[model samples]
Target: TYYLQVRGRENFEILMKLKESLELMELVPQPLVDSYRQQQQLLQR
Candidate 1:
């Protein structure tokens, strides 16, 4: 469980970074990033 949690967090961070870069490059929109953020937040909870 602990390992899973750690992996999840790491994965979330990576997703966030990818979203951030994509947003910066205008490859994706804010809504998509927001969606990913929401999913990550739920996983953390």
Candidate 2:
């Protein structure tokens, strides 16, 4: 087993996958993914 860091990429990847489900439902708004893309870099760090 491994640790899950709150701001780490692992957690983001997991949650982001779930988040995409909303995209399929057409429930997400514009600029949200773009904004999240920026934070993806933050998680990488």
Candidate 3:
């Protein structure tokens, strides 16, 4: 299971840092980031 859905904190900085540490690349891909935002919004509703 992807989790009882254990996603991380809703802090963009955290994700951005992680994505950067993952080799100085994009602070997370645009499409993937968009999906996460959508997921959170959906969950909020």
Candidate 4:
């Protein structure tokens, strides 16, 4: 398993781009996209 942290004002956009990039690279599961989004939201709170 792998973990990634995306922060800063542009974190959400950055994470979306990262998700696409990771998908293109076949580095992670598609389900992880939602996982990252949820984690970002949690971090925001």
Point out where model 1 deviates above 4 Å. 1-7, 27-45
Which candidate ranks first by lDDT, i.e. highest? Answer: 4
Taking the tens digit of each residue's C-alpha lDDT, what string does model 2 give over 1-45? Answer: 344446888888987787678557465565887788788998987
Top candidate (TM-score):
1
Query: Which of the two candidates, 2 or 3, achieves a greater TM-score against the reference?
Result: 2
Stronger candidate by TM-score (3 vs 4): 3
In model 3, which runs have C-alpha deviations exceeding 4 angstroms? 1-26
Worst 10 residues of 2 by lDDT: 22-31
Q: Rate the local accuracy (lDDT) of all candidates.
A: 0.73, 0.73, 0.67, 0.77
Query: After superposing candidate 4, which stretches have Cα over 4 Å from the reference?
Result: 1-9, 27-45
Residue 30 C-alpha lDDT in model 1: 76
lDDT of 1 by residue, 1-45 (tens): 122233587898987787678657666677997888889987886
- Model 1: colliding residue pairs: none
Per-residue CA lDDT of model 4 for 1-45, tens digit only, reads 577766785987888787888668666676897788889987887
Q: What TM-score would you give candidate 3 relative to the actual structure?
A: 0.35
- Local lDDT at 44 for model 3: 78
TM-score computed on alpha carbons, candidate 4: 0.34
Clashing pairs in 4: none
Clashes of each: 0, 0, 0, 0
Q: What is the C-alpha RMSD of each candidate to the true structure, in Å?
A: 11.7, 11.1, 13.4, 11.9
